[PDB]
Design a protein around this ligand. Structure first.
Ligand SMILES: CCCCCCCCCCCCCCCCCC(=O)OC[C@H](COP(=O)([O-])OCC(O)COP(=O)([O-])OC[C@@H](COC(=O)CCCCCCCCCCCCCCCCC)OC(=O)CCCCCCCCCCCCCCCCC)OC(=O)CCCCCCCCCCCCCCCCC
Ligand code: BCL
Ligand code: BCL
Ligand code: BCL
Ligand code: BCL
Ligand code: BCL
Ligand code: BCL
Ligand code: BCL
Ligand SMILES: CC[C@H]1c2cc3[nH]c4c(c3C)C(=O)[C@H](C(=O)OC)c4c3nc(cc4[nH]c(cc(n2)[C@@H]1C)c(C(C)=O)c4C)[C@@H](C)[C@@H]3CCC(=O)OC/C=C(\C)CCC[C@H](C)CCC[C@H](C)CCCC(C)C
Ligand SMILES: [Ca+2]
Ligand SMILES: [Ca+2]
Lengths: 62, 42, 43, 41, 277, 50, 259, 44, 43, 43, 42, 49, 42, 41, 34, 43, 40, 38, 44, 38, 43, 41
């Protein structure tokens, strides 16, 4: 499908595609960091702290 | 002829654009297979 | 239907269409993540 | 200084006076009805 | 009506979308496609604001006092989903209408710029104001994880939102991007008074005097501060100061909560903890 | 008020005065109705009568 | 003296109300100053009444103010009255608010983005009375900064990349030392036309001036000046407006719409 | 010349005829609506 | 009273008149809906 | 009434009317959705 | 008049406008009849 | 003053009428609102009758 | 001269301006007499 | 069928497609705001 | 030509409305709202 | 002192003086109202 | 101000006469105000 | 812009659209197996 | 003594003097109203 | 502006200042009688 | 493949790349330092 | 268009590829060493 490169500048198409893919990769990595399930920066041996004796991590709200 | 590439220049660009895309996609598939083994999401 | 590409420029039509599909695709993924029942990055 | 002749100034004043008077007439009737409904003084 | 020199500028074309269909004027306004879309985006948003005022927070607190009218975003418990209309869903629709109206207004300015053959600085500058609004109601709420972080739509209630968000960081003056944004705002106001004064004092000189020249303008501020930026560059500077203030204000609020959760004075502990002292 | 009260329309434009008076009266009428609705004594929609 | 004026009124409430009266008066003043240009308005309301109704809105116009121009160039009244002017275009549709289609060649129509008023037919003068916008051939003490590329000798290309000419000279503002125009020698008839710096995109690496406004073939119809070494305020507007028309008239695609 | 609007006596008479007729029909519907509203829920 | 149309433009009057009536009509409906005594949608 | 189109052009009027009707239709639906007694999506 | 339309074409537009407007009102009346049957508001 | 009519030779007796009518209306609005602010002269909330 | 008003026009305007102002004052005096009867303030 | 002599059929399709898509989005979001008709639960 | 286009503009709507009707029939089967 | 109008424009001076007197009249009336001893609006 | 002594004598005459009239009713107002409630 | 370069675009456009819709259907069938929403 | 008006413009001196004196007179009255010893509007 | 107008303005200025100071002196005498400050 | 350098200027694409990699390297190290699980300077 | 010849582009690409491979070689070793020290998955 060479027709695409007849109508789109190869330098601008690669700059746009490269920036898009890099932005997409950064966004998806962050989306995994948002979820603690896939937050690999917590460490492979991550264990959530155990709450005992009526502990609550957060104050009560609404 | 909007940019200036002929029928030959455009086909040469498309020839390795697919090859680079295939190389990029192949690494992506390996990455997701490894990602699935580490921690499946579905 | 086939002659509709003489009136609408195929280059601008394709650019707008892909921009639409990309934004729509992000929106649906955003909606599913926002809903806890279909958030696949949890559980 | 407005482009209005002597006759139009009198003619407009005549209709203006009637329209203002009729508007004042309806207003007075409304206030009489308002006073009967709920006097304020 | 149109200005006495305006008729020679009312030309067809330059529309981004719509062509000849919406290319016309209503009184002084140019409408175009985005004037139609912008008007009905604004009309629906305003009518839903009035309806939100009509139902109010509840029946007993409902008020048409323009200061007290408030359309609040959803509770944070709804996250990024849609809320019921009377539980913040109205705010979500109005926000969408506001975004539609603002973007349509910016795009209508682009079409007007194309008709007049002038630069696109004005729609570009307006995009910064839109971007600041988008940070407040879209980017920051999404980063925070709930539409309830948007500010309520009320003349005084959105001030209560600003106050409480500010005190969520215990002393908001220590926000470094806030300090930079305020510096640009204050400098812009100073630069605007200086520029307005200089133009007025030159074109309206002392009694029995002729209109001054560009030499008088350059000489005047060189006599005062030793530097004159120039007649063209003061407009670059004014645009830069105004846009930088909004850019750094958008930064200051988007880092408050998403990228910083402690009190803002505590952020300066990086400087206090340098081993130099 | 003298047979020369019509001279005012030689001074002030009748059309602009008519637009001004209609706009002023409409705003004044809205204002007075809203003021009455803002009082518990004369809010006819919330007095409970009948 | 107390803070309370009545049971409900207080000093702060009176002060804010006092401001609103001042602010209302201020806006009326500012709107009156706004209407010193382009008023009375041009409307079908005036056209259908034969000039009997002047459209000025509210506030009405102010008394004329005088600008005494330096070097006895005349006194100009801001709320002046200008002669009626006929546009070089026809309406696309007869309903009010409809736009106009320029007659003939749009670039040479003098309508729309190429429209321009008739400014005073005299040069803008420096504080000493010398012409302000002059070429570098007569502003001898003026020179290009050492770190910047000299525009002279650069190639001028149009919207389509076609060569339009070369920069023969640079026109500078003497009061404020900046470049205003590039004098371009058109390589079609060897006639020098001015190119405003606002329509010029310098390409330092290739020593090329890119003019996105118009094509290379359009440089032959740029308005010219009576005197080769000075330009009047009248001619400055004509030159700049011609390039501005190119932003809408140079190509068919520029009239839009995108989709 | 002409009037302040460029309308003659016949043009003003003709528009006024349609205007008062449309206004009369609008006021007729308004009166009926208020009668129905009064039957539904009297306010005074 | 037919001479009011030699003072006011009929087109500009109708737009102003129709726009005002529509806003006035919305205003009264909103006012009634804001009072529970006349809100017809509460039950 | 056919002379109303000699006053209001069918270009600006026909698209303004459709926009006003659509916003009016949306507003009424939103009003009913906001009224618990007439919210048909309540279940 | 002040639109660019004559009396003949303005009449022609009025016929199509009225017939379309009537069909819209007819659907509306049916819609409110069904709405009244579903849940009366008065 | 034997000749007070001479005032109209220096102030236009058209913008004076507009200014006077606007000024009197605003002053009339202000005094009514001042009385409404007063617990004694508020005729809408005084309960009489 | 200053206002485009002649000496005779100013005489004409002043007579009716005084008459209108006198009648406006007369309504005002009646209003304040009624106001004083309704609720005196001194 | 005479609507096309006042509306350009090529510009109308873009506005029509923009209108219908926006309308379809609004209805889906309204249904998502309703717990009874929220299918993502 | 305002008639040739009307022959395909209307033709498209019927296909769209038919799918719309099918979707609403299925939606009613999934969850009635009246 | 008739010569004082050589340097003071009668039109500019008169309107400025009348505006000055009005605000002074407002200021003094309001100062008296703020004083409980001279407030004539209280009972 | 382009106002010769010819027209600066009768404007002053009215201005003084109007000022005396204005000051005349001011004094009466203050006498009535003093009788109502003296401030000294 | 003639039929020669307009019929070629339609052939590519429909082929891309059919391929895009084909895998879209596969995605939704897989999504339905993972977690049905009705 | 009379020579002062050669350099000082009488037109500018009078308006500045009147503005200065009024502000000074206004300031002193306000200062006295602030002081309870000289406030004549307190009724005592 | 000229030399001759300087004495003309000065005479009126002095008399006007003298009259203004005269009223000021009377006001301060009355003010001292009402409530002396020293 | 080598023909990509006829498109992108080799000088600019090396300053941009090296600056990008340096920023990326700094970013990742700072991310790991801020993570208690991977901070290597805590001892 | 930039100015580099096809032969001259071969010279840059050959050095670029070898230099990129060398950088990736050190990077891979660094991650292999990091994985041996403390695996992160
Ligand atoms: C302290 C800060 C805050 C203070 C409070 C601020 C509150 C907010 C202020 C809001 C102001 C809105 C202004 C809207 C302008 C609308 C256009 C217009 O007609 O202008 C009228 C007027 C000028 O009239 P004109 O152009 O001479 O009259 C033309 C003829 O009359 C033409 O004759 P005509 O018959 O056409 O006249 C009818 C005219 C009548 O206009 C009015 O009645 C007045 C409207 C505003 C009131 O309406 C129109 O001209 C429009 C025709 C109908 C079209 C309307 C719908 C447009 C749809 C297309 C939209 C596309 C998108 O413009 C203004 O009044 C501007 C006021 C500016 C206020 C600024 C205060 C805020 C800023 C303060 C801080 C800044 C520093 C201060 C130091
Ligand atoms: C507080 C005790 C009383 C009361 C005590 C007083 C006293 C005392 C006065 C008024 C006066 C007025 N009151 Mg009241 N008034 C009360 C409650 C109200 C209420 C209300 C809803 O509660 C309203 C709407 C009003 C309204 C009015 C206006 C009719 C009038 C001020 C008009 C004006 O400023 O013209 C100024 C603007 C103009 C343009 C004037 C033009 C003059 C022309 C040249 C003369 C002919 C006029 C022409 C025919 C147009 C008619 C306009 C009239 C001024 C109405 N009062 C309460 C109940 N009221 C004042 C009055 O009587 O004015 C006539 C006045 O002195
Ligand atoms: C929720 C259950 C599943 C899931 C359910 C589904 C379902 C159901 C679908 C997808 C689909 C997609 N999913 Mg999924 N998906 C999930 C999780 C993910 C995650 C993730 C990290 O979790 C990612 C990254 C994705 C990503 C994707 C995409 C591959 C795909 C949407 C493509 C698209 O929108 O095309 C639109 C974009 C374009 C067409 C290109 C846009 C071009 C640019 C961006 C715009 C500018 C245009 C430019 C200027 C000019 C271009 C002109 C041309 C070059 C000539 N999914 C979860 C796990 N997913 C859809 C699919 O299969 O599509 C193929 C689909 O139907
Ligand atoms: C105490 C509260 C009472 C009440 C007491 C009063 C009193 C008292 C008055 C009104 C008046 C009005 N009331 Mg009410 N009113 C109440 C409740 C309402 C409600 C409601 C939903 O509850 C509404 C919508 C209204 C609305 C109205 C308007 C009909 C009218 C104000 C019109 C105007 O401002 O003209 C301003 C705009 C114009 C003047 C422009 C029009 C110019 C025209 C063209 C003049 C033409 C003259 C020509 C000869 C024809 C003359 C006909 C008349 C002018 C009608 N009232 C309650 C029950 N109401 C006023 C009135 O009666 O006015 C007629 C009035 O004095
Ligand atoms: C206790 C509270 C804290 C504090 C908490 C906050 C919080 C929270 C915020 C700020 C924000 C700001 N603060 Mg702070 N701030 C404090 C004290 C100050 C002080 C001071 C003197 O002490 C100053 C000068 C400031 C200054 C600032 C600015 C830097 C900034 C607001 C401008 C802006 O955002 O533009 C942006 C402009 C817009 C968003 C306008 C958008 C315009 C839109 C596009 C157009 C609308 C059109 C409209 C509807 C038209 C209507 C039609 C009419 C007819 C005309 N703050 C105190 C210490 N501050 C805000 C900020 O930075 O936001 C980005 C913000 O959220
Ligand atoms: C107590 C509350 C009652 C109620 C009591 C009343 C009363 C009382 C009245 C109305 C009136 C109206 N009600 Mg109701 N109404 C209620 C609930 C509703 C609801 C709802 C969803 O609940 C809606 C949508 C409405 C809607 C309406 C409108 C049909 C009408 C106001 C139109 C208008 O303002 O024109 C103004 C806008 C225009 C004129 C713009 C015109 C646009 C075009 C371009 C011009 C064409 C003019 C045409 C040729 C002539 C017009 C008149 C014709 C003879 C038809 N009501 C409840 C149940 N309603 C009023 C009415 O009947 O008016 C007819 C009225 O007096
Ligand atoms: C506090 C005790 C009293 C009271 C004590 C006093 C005392 C003491 C005075 C007033 C004065 C005034 N009071 Mg009082 N006053 C009270 C409460 C009020 C209330 C109220 C709402 O209760 C109102 C509306 C007023 C209103 C007024 C004004 C009539 C007047 C201020 C005029 C002015 O500001 O000129 C500023 C504006 C101008 C100068 C504009 C110029 C235009 C006018 C027409 C100048 C004309 C000049 C000359 C007279 C022309 C005539 C010449 C011949 C015809 C030839 N008072 C209370 C009840 N009041 C003052 C006064 O009497 O002034 C006359 C005054 O000294
Ligand atoms: C967190 C766990 C480990 C750790 C895990 C890793 C991992 C995994 C990696 C690194 C990498 C690096 N680490 Mg470490 N690293 C740690 C802690 C540190 C500390 C510290 C004080 O604690 C420092 C200073 C470093 C420093 C470094 C750099 C040497 C290197 C980043 C390269 C780069 O940014 O490219 C920017 C620079 C350029 C792009 C220049 C390009 C040069 C090219 C290749 C050609 C020039 C070659 C040569 C230099 C010159 C010869 C030819 C010349 C042109 C003349 N690490 C901790 C202890 N580190 C990365 C690496 O090894 O890269 C090589 C890497 O992948
Ligand atoms: C970025 C630099 C500064 C800037 C620039 C700027 N603003 C601009 C422009 C530019 C260059 C325009 O060209 C454009 C314009 O037309 O100006 C006259 C505009 C404009 N800036 C405006 C306002 C504005 N700008 C602000 C700020 C700033 N504008 C920055 C400080 C603010 C602030 C700080 O509060 C306001 C209020 C408008 C006057 C105008 C844009 C008009 C517009 O978009 O019209 C469309 C909308 C309507 C007609 C009505 C609103 C419709 C909505 C659906 C209603 C709901 C709104 C909101 C969500 C709720 C209510 C808000 C509550 C907080 C009360
Ligand atoms: Ca009642
Ligand atoms: Ca009472």
């Amino acid at each position: 499908l060479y027709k695409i490169w007849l109508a789109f500048d190869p330098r601008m198409a690669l700059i746009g595609l490269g920036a898009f893919l890099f932005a997409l990769a950064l966004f998806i990595h962050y989306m995994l960091l948002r979820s603690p399930e896939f937050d690999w920066l917590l460490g492979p041996d991550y264990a959530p702290v155990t709450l005992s004796a009526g502990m609550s991590a957060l104050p009560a709200g609404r | 002829s909007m940019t200036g590439l002929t029928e030959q220049e455009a086909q040469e660009f498309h020839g390795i654009f697919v090859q680079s895309m295939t190389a990029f996609f192949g690494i992506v598939v390996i990455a997701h297979i490894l990602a699935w083994l580490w921690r499946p999401w579905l | 239907m086939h002659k509709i590409w003489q009136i609408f420029d195929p280059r601008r039509t394709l650019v707008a269409l892909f921009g639409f599909l990309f934004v729509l695709g992000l929106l649906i993924h955003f909606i599913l993540l926002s809903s806890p029942a279909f958030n696949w990055l949890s559980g | 200084m407005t482009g209005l002749t002597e006759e139009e100034a009198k003619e407009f004043h005549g209709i203006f006076t009637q329209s203002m008077t009729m508007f004042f007439g309806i207003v007075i009737i409304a206030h009489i009805l308002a006073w009967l409904w709920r006097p304020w003084l | 009506a149109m200005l006495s020199f305006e008729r020679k500028y009312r030309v067809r074309g330059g529309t981004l979308i719509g062509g000849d269909l919406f290319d016309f004027w209503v009184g002084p306004f140019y409408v175009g496609f985005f004037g139609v879309a912008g008007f009905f985006f604004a009309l629906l948003g305003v009518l839903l604001i009035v309806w939100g005022a009509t139902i109010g927070p509840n029946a007993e607190l409902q008020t048409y006092n323009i200061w007290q009218i408030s359309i609040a975003p959803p509770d944070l418990s709804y996250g990024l989903g849609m809320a019921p209309m009377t539980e913040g869903g109205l705010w979500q629709i109005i926000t969408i209408c506001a975004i539609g109206a603002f973007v349509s207004w910016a795009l209508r300015e682009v079409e007007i710029c194309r008709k007049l053959g002038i630069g696109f600085h004005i729609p570009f500058a307006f995009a910064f104001a839109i971007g600041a609004y988008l940070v407040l109601v879209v980017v920051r709420p999404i980063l925070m994880g709930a539409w309830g972080h948007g500010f309520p739509y009320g003349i005084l209630s959105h001030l209560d939102w600003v106050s409480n968000v500010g005190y969520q960081f215990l002393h908001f003056h220590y926000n470094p991007a806030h300090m930079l944004a305020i510096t640009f705002f204050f400098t812009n106001c100073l630069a605007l008074s200086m520029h307005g004064s200089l133009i007025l004092s030159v074109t309206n000189p002392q009694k029995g005097e002729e209109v001054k020249t560009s030499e008088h303008e350059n000489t005047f501020f060189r006599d005062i501060v030793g530097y004159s930026i120039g007649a063209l560059a003061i407009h670059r500077l004014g645009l830069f100061l105004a846009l930088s203030a909004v850019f750094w204000s958008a930064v200051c609020i988007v880092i408050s909560g998403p990228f910083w959760t402690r009190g803002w004075p505590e952020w300066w502990n990086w400087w206090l903890e340098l081993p130099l002292w | 008020m003298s047979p020369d009260l019509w001279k005012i329309w030689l001074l002030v434009d009748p059309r602009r005065i008519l637009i001004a008076v209609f706009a002023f009266l409409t705003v004044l009428g809205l204002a007075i109705h809203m003021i009455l609705l803002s009082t518990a004594e004369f809010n006819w929609l919330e007095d409970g009568v009948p | 003296m107390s803070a309370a004026i009545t049971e409900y009124m207080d000093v702060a409430q009176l002060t804010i109300w006092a401001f609103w009266f001042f602010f209302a008066g201020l806006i009326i003043y500012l709107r009156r100053e706004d209407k010193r240009e382009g008023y009375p308005l041009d409307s079908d309301r005036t056209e259908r009444s034969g000039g009997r109704v002047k459209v000025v809105g509210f506030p009405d116009l102010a008394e004329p103010k005088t600008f005494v121009l330096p070097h006895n160039a005349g006194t100009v009244m801001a709320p002046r009255v200008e002669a009626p002017t006929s546009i070089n275009a026809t309406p696309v549709a007869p309903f009010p608010g409809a736009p106009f289609e320029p007659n003939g060649d749009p670039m040479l129509s003098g309508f729309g983005p190429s429209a321009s008023p008739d400014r005073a037919k005299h040069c803008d003068l420096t504080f000493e009375g010398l012409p302000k916008i002059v070429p570098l051939r007569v502003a001898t003490d003026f020179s290009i900064a050492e770190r910047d590329p000299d525009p002279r000798g650069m190639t001028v290309v149009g919207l389509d990349g076609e060569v339009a000419g070369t920069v023969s000279d640079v026109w500078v503002d003497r009061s404020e030392p900046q470049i205003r125009y590039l004098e371009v020698k058109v390589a079609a008839g060897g006639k020098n036309v001015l190119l405003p710096i606002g329509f010029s995109r310098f390409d330092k690496k290739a020593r090329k001036v890119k003019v996105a406004a118009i094509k290379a073939a359009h440089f032959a119809n740029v308005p010219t000046l009576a005197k080769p070494d000075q330009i009047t305020l009248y001619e400055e507007d004509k030159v700049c407006a011609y390039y501005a028309g190119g932003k809408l008239y140079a190509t068919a695609e520029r009239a839009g719409p995108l989709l």
